[PDB]
Amino acid sequence: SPEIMKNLSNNFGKAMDQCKDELSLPDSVVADLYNFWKDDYVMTDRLAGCAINCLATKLDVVDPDGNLHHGNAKDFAMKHGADETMAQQLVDIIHGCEKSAPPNDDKCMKTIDVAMCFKKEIHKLNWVPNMDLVIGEVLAEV
Numbered sequence: 001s002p003e004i005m006k007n008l009s010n011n012f013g014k015a016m017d018q019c020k021d022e023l024s025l026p027d028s029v030v031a032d033l034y035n036f037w038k039d040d041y042v043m044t045d046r047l048a049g050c051a052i053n054c055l056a057t058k059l060d061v062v063d064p065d066g067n068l069h070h071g072n073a074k075d076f077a078m079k080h081g082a083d084e085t086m087a088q089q090l091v092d093i094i095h096g097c098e099k100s101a102p103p104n105d106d107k108c109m110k111t112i113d114v115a116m117c118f119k120k121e122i123h124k125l126n127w128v129p130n131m132d133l134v135i136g137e138v139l140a141e142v
Helices: 008-012 016-022 027-033 046-052 055-059 071-079 084-099 110-125
Strands: none
Touching: 008 055, 016 055, 027 046, 046 110, 055 071, 071 084, 084 110
């Protein structure tokens, strides 16, 4: 859905060069990252996955002393972009797929194993009919 497809970092766009430096994104990644064509490929590079939550996270979102900013990052997402129900659909995959993920050490790539594990899950659900959010805004003048 376009809801969560509206990326916070894309909306912000406050500092491109400083997000570029912060992750030390190689030219190959940040370039492919800017691919505006909706190819819909598999997220293979950690620097891409990380850059998705780079703008609004490097702005301000640290729960603890600097590192391990888990709470505020999820709290920030629930207050801006995804409602609590969507974040709660993600957290479940995050915890289970990351826990069941192979011990291949790449801090940002693990987050990809869970991310793709989520669209895998939603794809297994596949057939889900919507109730249609029909809202009749009755504006009665005079």
